[PDB]
Amino acid sequence: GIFGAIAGFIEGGWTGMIDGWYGYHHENSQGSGYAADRESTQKAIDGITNKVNSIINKMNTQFEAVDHEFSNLERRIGNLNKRMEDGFLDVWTYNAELLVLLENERTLDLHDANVKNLYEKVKSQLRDNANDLGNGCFEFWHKCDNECMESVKNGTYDYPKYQK
Amino acid sequence: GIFGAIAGFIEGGWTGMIDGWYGYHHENSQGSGYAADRESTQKAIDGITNKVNSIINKMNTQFEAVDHEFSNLERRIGNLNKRMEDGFLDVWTYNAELLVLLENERTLDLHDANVKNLYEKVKSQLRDNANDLGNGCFEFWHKCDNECMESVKNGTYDYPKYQK
Amino acid sequence: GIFGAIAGFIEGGWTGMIDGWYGYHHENSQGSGYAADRESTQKAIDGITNKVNSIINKMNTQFEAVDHEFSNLERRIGNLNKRMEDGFLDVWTYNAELLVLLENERTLDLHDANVKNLYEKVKSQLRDNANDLGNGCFEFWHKCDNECMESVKNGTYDYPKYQK
Amino acid sequence: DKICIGYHANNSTTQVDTLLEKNVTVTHSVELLENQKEKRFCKIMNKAPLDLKDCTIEGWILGNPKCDLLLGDQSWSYIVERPNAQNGICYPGVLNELEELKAFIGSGERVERFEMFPKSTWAGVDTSRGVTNACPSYTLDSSFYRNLVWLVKTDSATYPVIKGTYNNTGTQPILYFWGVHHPPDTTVQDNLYGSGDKYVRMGTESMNFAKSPEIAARPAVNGQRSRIDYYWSVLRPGETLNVESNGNLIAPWYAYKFVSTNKKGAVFKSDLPIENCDATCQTIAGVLKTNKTFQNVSPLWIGECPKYVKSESLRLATGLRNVPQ
Amino acid sequence: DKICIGYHANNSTTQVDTLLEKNVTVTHSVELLENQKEKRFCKIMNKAPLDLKDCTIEGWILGNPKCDLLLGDQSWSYIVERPNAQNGICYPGVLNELEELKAFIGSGERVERFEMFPKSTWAGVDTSRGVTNACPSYTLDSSFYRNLVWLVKTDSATYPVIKGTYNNTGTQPILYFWGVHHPPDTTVQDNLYGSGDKYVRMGTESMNFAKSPEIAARPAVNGQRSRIDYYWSVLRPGETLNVESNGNLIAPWYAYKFVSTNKKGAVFKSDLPIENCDATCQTIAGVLKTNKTFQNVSPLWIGECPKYVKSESLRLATGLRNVPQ
Amino acid sequence: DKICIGYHANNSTTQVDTLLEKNVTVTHSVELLENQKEKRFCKIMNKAPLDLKDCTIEGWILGNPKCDLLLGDQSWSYIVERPNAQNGICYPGVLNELEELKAFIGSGERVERFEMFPKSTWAGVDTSRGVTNACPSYTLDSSFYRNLVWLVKTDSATYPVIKGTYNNTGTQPILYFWGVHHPPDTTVQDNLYGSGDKYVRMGTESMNFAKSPEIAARPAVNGQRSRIDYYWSVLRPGETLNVESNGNLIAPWYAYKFVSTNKKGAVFKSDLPIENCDATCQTIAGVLKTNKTFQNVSPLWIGECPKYVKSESLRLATGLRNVPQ
Numbered sequence A, B, C: 001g002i003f004g005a006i007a008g009f010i011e012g013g014w015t016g017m018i019d020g021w022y023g024y025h026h027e028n029s030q031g032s033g034y035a036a037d038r039e040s041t042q043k044a045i046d047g048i049t050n051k052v053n054s055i056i057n058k059m060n061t062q063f064e065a066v067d068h069e070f071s072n073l074e075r076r077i078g079n080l081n082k083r084m085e086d087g088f089l090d091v092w093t094y095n096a097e098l099l100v101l102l103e104n105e106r107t108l109d110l111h112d113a114n115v116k117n118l119y120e121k122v123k124s125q126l127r128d129n130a131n132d133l134g135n136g137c138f139e140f141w142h143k144c145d146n147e148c149m150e151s152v153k154n155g156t157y158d159y160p161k162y163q164k
Numbered sequence D, E, F: 001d002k003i004c005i006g007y008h009a010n011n012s013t014t015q016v017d018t019l020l021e022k023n024v025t026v027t028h029s030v031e032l033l034e035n036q037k038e039k040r041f042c043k044i045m046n047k048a049p050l051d052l053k054d055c056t057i058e059g060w061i062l063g064n065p066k067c068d069l070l071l072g073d074q075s076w077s078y079i080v081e082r083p084n085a086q087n088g089i090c091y092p093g094v095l096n097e098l099e100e101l102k103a104f105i106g107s108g109e110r111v112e113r114f115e116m117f118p119k120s121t122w123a124g125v126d127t128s129r130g131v132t133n134a135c136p137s138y139t140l141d142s143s144f145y146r147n148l149v150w151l152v153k154t155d156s157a158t159y160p161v162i163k164g165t166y167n168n169t170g171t172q173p174i175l176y177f178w179g180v181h182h183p184p185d186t187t188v189q190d191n192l193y194g195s196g197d198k199y200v201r202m203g204t205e206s207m208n209f210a211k212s213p214e215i216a217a218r219p220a221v222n223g224q225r226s227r228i229d230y231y232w233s234v235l236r237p238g239e240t241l242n243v244e245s246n247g248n249l250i251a252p253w254y255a256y257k258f259v260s261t262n263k264k265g266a267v268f269k270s271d272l273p274i275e276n277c278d279a280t281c282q283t284i285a286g287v288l289k290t291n292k293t294f295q296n297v298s299p300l301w302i303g304e305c306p307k308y309v310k311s312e313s314l315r316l317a318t319g320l321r322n323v324p325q
């Protein structure tokens, strides 16, 4: 990824997390467990459903060939017709294949950046109260229960409190 | 934004700043006030004027329909003509609509990245002499007058001096 | 660059490094010297060879004009033919020119991001054992010989060891 | 105590391509392109196509006696001609403007066969001896077209001038046919129509027609050295037709009331079976039942079909890159 | 002491769409597509179009007597035919190759009416009795076309052979017309042209023409059961034309010196008024006064117009996402 | 002790454009577009084109006596006609359906000239006096086409009916030609073919033809006021042709066995020299020797060529932005 995250410094993915695209794996005294960040997930989901539906929508026309026949002295207009039909066929084939390639590239880059930005979202909150390993895991200095983790998750982590 | 900045960690925008796209809101003993970073602004402006003029330029051809009439025994070539005109109409409509969608997406991403990079430009200069709140505001430890702020703005901020 | 690196905080380039696109210029007691990061280089190279070959591949059709002649009473179908040939010519010209512009933009952005991400790769490894100048050079606090530098390069830099 | 940031993965081995990278496995994708078809012809708008079977379009519309299965009224969503249908134009000749007639019938939905000129129209001639062994029915070795009539001088006298009128007072256009007989020599010309210069002429408000015989000996075709020039036209609502000839007239007899579709219209040359099923999209290659955007089966269809395209796959990634471990 | 980094915002509620997101308000955008037109026909290159008014192109160019408003010279940037113009071909018949003639005139800029064959050209015949109540002027119930002349045998004798020549020694091509009269029966043929087989023939360096009458009774049209076959051609600079007939000739009389444009050329079927204004782009739907790249008014235009397209809007974001608060 | 991160640079001044930025120097790029050509005609598939030289296609195929350089068999990868070739149709007339004949020959690869109707075929007439000073060879002032023969009544008697047959029992289609002579007056008609109504007729399985003379006086062309209507057709394998005429027949004599290509086929109007070189791509403008994807030389070619396009350059950046210092 161009944002360095997916198959980058975060070297792989959790088959464990089955309820979202991006999320969390906490680790504390009550236990661990996976849980997805529903917000940035639903954002990605809406944006990409949008991409797909816009692509399908723009592609909702058909050039239409015809069974018309041409005599022996109509070779020229016959050939004209063939060249036209093949022509249009060629440009629509090109448009489709190219658009698919390009869009896939940018879709992947999108996922990558969303991950990177979630990581940043966290690090920005926890600044001194933890240790950045550099593989996208954070090690606390203090204690974090469930109402603690939850506050990081729903973005309301009180840094003053745990800074001492 | 995929760079996290606009409507991200910088949650909103200043209607106050009316002289640029990206900029500053300092706060010191002489007072506050807004002021735009004319450099990265003029850069964005030139790049995007360029995008628009390139788009208009590439679109400077017209397929041209004709009033030609066809008899009762010219149904085939008539239909051929219609299919051609509609065909081309369809591909140009598609090209336009699609290009607009895509380009808007990437334009917005551009603005976002320019903001992010200005933020970075600053943080890189001021490293210890201030406190990163994480919402794109920086709180000094020392004193900063106007010839002080100005040096940050025009990129010549002397970090040695204020580090003690 | 939108990732800020090329002609950004890294203000220029090394004509010295002639064996890769991205790399290193170390500086220690045995001497200095340039050396390219063959991994991310070969990655870029493969990805961009891929881009070029996909572009050439998708463009591997030709609309084909014809020498066909039309009488004085065939003005209409003659004009029909001309309009068709010019039409297709126009759309292929547009597709080519536009695709070139766009793709160049994104290629450059790719190089920029690859640089930025290498920088990050390093900084992530060396965290306390060096000083980030902010122009993409890192100044050690400890001593780094050649088997030392090499371990940074091949990504196996032991941070515990040199942290004291 | 700690917390980690990461992303989804799964058992998926589905791959996509990018400008930078081919063969890239991802978590969730979608295929926009249909390649599956049912090799058959089904109904469109709950309306069934027309199977010409062992008849060509010419043989059908001219009323070839071995095409009597098709005789009378017909309605269709589309037309199916069979690749090696044997019954078309039995008596050697050319159908003038055949291709445009095929296009016109293609643009149709229904025909009503009716009688336009009873044999009584033609006065002082023999309307009952117009037959040839070139045109057999399944029940005799010498017949002729059901929609045409071969007028021949009465068993002695000469060929009088004969006249016909049909005033189209109805709301529908009429497709109709006639012909000119081109004999192989002078003596046959005389045996059939008597001597003297002969003509065939036809008038409407917006069309007229004149032609004389073109007597010469041609290669044998279905044992005939004579030819017939076949002609077709459409009498519009309000128009009326005058027929006038003093010889060599293959006179219209039956004709068709025609219903124009204003939509596309299809004539498929194919051997696929017509089955009693339903469909909302029908290619010459088969039926597509899809919700997908693209297809690579055929460019020729009737109904609402995906955009034809040459691609093998058009796979679009929606999920992220798959990296299980 | 502190300093903040941020971005612009404003009172704008203008929105755009992206592949990811619809309805997204932004600070500054631009609209590339014009949808506003002035429903009228204006001048092009300071040159005014031709209003045929109550004449069709046929009626204009053949010199229908009720089209005398248009008689003589004309120059145009483009042509406007009115949807329900009443005066075209008054005496029933067909204009051969009408569509190609319309295309040719479409490709023009100017005509100079001149006299090509004075009635004196035709010797030993009556050039003064060629009139019909099918073709009235606004001042008598029986006239004929201004550019054609109906030759009839002199009040007793037979129809002699008649001959005409025009050598185009000028630098401009000449558009001209003639006809063949097809009578309804033998006795009318004889009353007008006398007995015997009749022909009409015309020769140039690169064209020849022969035709005989096609005598039959047709449905009444403007009270006529006769027809006329109209024909048109272009005598090139250097070419010369020979006319020869012994009967049934509707002889050319007036003709046109024609100026070919080499540019596109337009013939608009429309009812919009022609006003005394100016324009650099003129659709069949109206005038566009724009600097924009696209338009959705019409695909048919003359002059320099934006690329026609089906879109409603083509709005392009230039500023950033608007987030005031 | 320290270590730095950075990127490549070099002596390159090669530039590219982006949507955001024009004139941007980069380290490595590639040019996808060819603009260089060799102004000449070379061989295709090791097969050489046909240089018509001072003959037009008409003059070649009809057997104009000054085109005898081309007489006999020919094979070609493509055809080259010269802009101002002087020898085409020497005796004034029209080649019917000329454009379609040009297209048909365009679709060819080879012709074998053979004799289809020896002069003996035509019985009781003069096959040896068919010559005109309109059609000189390089060795006499009065000849005629090598592939046609001008039949004239025997020096006294009248014109008998004459008949010819050729049964195409071979595997190749035959291109062949004939004509009808249109005299300028009655007395010439009589001097050549005698009196009485004359016809020319031709029959095959899938084609028939009848025509009479169209006698009139035309402008002088190559000193002739007469005309000839030229006609061409293709006798398919299995078909057989019957010729029958009692006057005014320009009879087929030699004809061609034709080989259809099924590939594209080209006829180039150009003055470029044909040289003894090789090529895998051949435009009307010259040869392209490239591995590049695009070209801006010409849209008209034979062989495997890059996609024609109007661009000046199509430069694609592969390396990064160049910033030496």
Ligand SMILES: CC(=O)N[C@@H]1[C@@H](O)[C@H](O[C@@H]2O[C@H](CO)[C@H](O)[C@H](O[C@]3(C(=O)O)C[C@H](O)[C@@H](NC(C)=O)[C@H]([C@H](O)[C@H](O)CO)O3)[C@H]2O)[C@@H](CO)O[C@H]1O
Pocket (backbone or CB within 6 Å): D129, D130, D131, D132, D133, D134, D142, D150, D152, D183, D184, D188, D222, D223, D224, D225, D226
């Ligand atoms: C060796 C050779 O060429 N011999 C021919 C000889 O065959 C030909 O006679 C014709 O032969 C065909 C063969 O299938 C038919 O028998 C023709 O018969 C009919 C017909 O059935 O079509 C009889 C029919 O009743 C006639 N139709 C009417 C309406 O009267 C027609 C009609 O006369 C012809 O079709 C005119 O085209 O023919 C039979 O004539 C003779 C004829 O000249 O010529 C020999 O050379």
Ligand SMILES: CC(=O)N[C@@H]1[C@@H](O)[C@H](O[C@@H]2O[C@H](CO)[C@H](O)[C@H](O[C@]3(C(=O)O)C[C@H](O)[C@@H](NC(C)=O)[C@H]([C@H](O)[C@H](O)CO)O3)[C@H]2O)[C@@H](CO)O[C@H]1O
Pocket (backbone or CB within 6 Å): E129, E130, E131, E132, E133, E134, E142, E150, E152, E183, E184, E188, E222, E223, E224, E225, E226
């Ligand atoms: C019930 C029926 O069908 N009766 C017709 C009868 O109408 C027809 O007479 C013709 O009637 C029309 C009616 O509008 C005109 O009156 C015809 O007159 C002229 C004409 O004006 O066109 C007179 C004119 O002077 C003649 N032109 C010249 C140059 O001499 C022509 C000319 O003779 C005809 O146009 C030939 O086409 O006609 C009038 O003839 C008669 C005619 O046969 O037939 C009845 O059955």
Ligand SMILES: CC(=O)N[C@@H]1[C@@H](O)[C@H](O[C@@H]2O[C@H](CO)[C@H](O)[C@H](O[C@]3(C(=O)O)C[C@H](O)[C@@H](NC(C)=O)[C@H]([C@H](O)[C@H](O)CO)O3)[C@H]2O)[C@@H](CO)O[C@H]1O
Pocket (backbone or CB within 6 Å): F129, F130, F131, F132, F133, F134, F142, F150, F152, F183, F184, F188, F222, F223, F224, F225, F226
């Ligand atoms: C002032 C004027 O118009 N005078 C013409 C006079 O020229 C013309 O005579 C014809 O003149 C041309 C001039 O090049 C030839 O000399 C014609 O000669 C031939 C020919 O060579 O073509 C002789 C030839 O042998 C004849 N061909 C055959 C097969 O017999 C032909 C043939 O008769 C004509 O081509 C028929 O088209 O002509 C010569 O006839 C006379 C002719 O009427 O008319 C004067 O007015």
Ligand SMILES: *[C@@H]1O[C@H](CO)[C@@H](O[C@@H]2O[C@H](CO)[C@@H](O)[C@H](O)[C@H]2NC(C)=O)[C@H](O)[C@H]1NC(C)=O
Pocket (backbone or CB within 6 Å): D219, D220, F167, F169, F240
């Ligand atoms: C053209 O030539 C072939 C000769 O090869 C003819 O073929 C014959 O046709 C008859 C029936 O028409 C058959 O019964 C013979 O047995 C065939 N023989 C051969 C050798 O083919 C053909 O009919 C000829 N046609 C004309 C019009 O000349």
Ligand SMILES: *[C@@H]1O[C@H](CO)[C@@H](O[C@@H]2O[C@H](CO)[C@@H](O)[C@H](O)[C@H]2NC(C)=O)[C@H](O)[C@H]1NC(C)=O
Pocket (backbone or CB within 6 Å): D167, D169, D240, E219, E220
């Ligand atoms: C065809 O039929 C209609 C009958 O419906 C004829 O219409 C008449 O036309 C005349 C004038 O031509 C009118 O004055 C009558 O009042 C009409 N009557 C009706 C009932 O329509 C029509 O003219 C006929 N035409 C031909 C050529 O037969």
Ligand SMILES: *[C@@H]1O[C@H](CO)[C@@H](O[C@@H]2O[C@H](CO)[C@@H](O)[C@H](O)[C@H]2NC(C)=O)[C@H](O)[C@H]1NC(C)=O
Pocket (backbone or CB within 6 Å): E167, E169, E240, F219, F220
């Ligand atoms: C048409 O007019 C011109 C007159 O300008 C004729 O030109 C002459 O042609 C003959 C040969 O055909 C030359 O020898 C004369 O010297 C030419 N003179 C001039 C003044 O051009 C032309 O031939 C005429 N043609 C017809 C058929 O009328």
Ligand SMILES: *[C@@H]1O[C@H](CO)[C@@H](O)[C@H](O)[C@H]1NC(C)=O
Pocket (backbone or CB within 6 Å): A146, A147, A150, A151, A154, A155, A156
């Ligand atoms: C965050 O989580 C707690 C539950 O642990 C909930 O009660 C609280 O209201 C949440 N607040 C926000 C802003 O998400």
Ligand SMILES: *[C@@H]1O[C@H](CO)[C@@H](O)[C@H](O)[C@H]1NC(C)=O
Pocket (backbone or CB within 6 Å): B146, B147, B150, B151, B154, B155, B156
């Ligand atoms: C920066 O700002 C000061 C004014 O406060 C100005 O005099 C100085 O020259 C500027 N230098 C640069 C490099 O912008």
Ligand SMILES: *[C@@H]1O[C@H](CO)[C@@H](O)[C@H](O)[C@H]1NC(C)=O
Pocket (backbone or CB within 6 Å): C146, C147, C150, C151, C154, C155, C156
């Ligand atoms: C790193 O470099 C040393 C040589 O300095 C080499 O022996 C070692 O195996 C390398 N290991 C990796 C993982 O690259």
Ligand SMILES: *[C@@H]1O[C@H](CO)[C@@H](O)[C@H](O)[C@H]1NC(C)=O
Pocket (backbone or CB within 6 Å): D022, D023
């Ligand atoms: C892509 O993968 C398929 C197997 O899934 C393989 O057969 C093919 O060769 C690969 N192509 C490329 C270009 O890597």
Ligand SMILES: *[C@@H]1O[C@H](CO)[C@@H](O)[C@H](O)[C@H]1NC(C)=O
Pocket (backbone or CB within 6 Å): E022, E023
């Ligand atoms: C977009 O906004 C308009 C109002 O500005 C609204 O009526 C429309 O439904 C919206 N469409 C979508 C797809 O959100």
Ligand SMILES: *[C@@H]1O[C@H](CO)[C@@H](O)[C@H](O)[C@H]1NC(C)=O
Pocket (backbone or CB within 6 Å): F022, F023
């Ligand atoms: C681009 O560079 C060329 C010289 O290499 C210069 O002549 C041209 O004017 C420049 N165009 C633009 C738009 O900067």
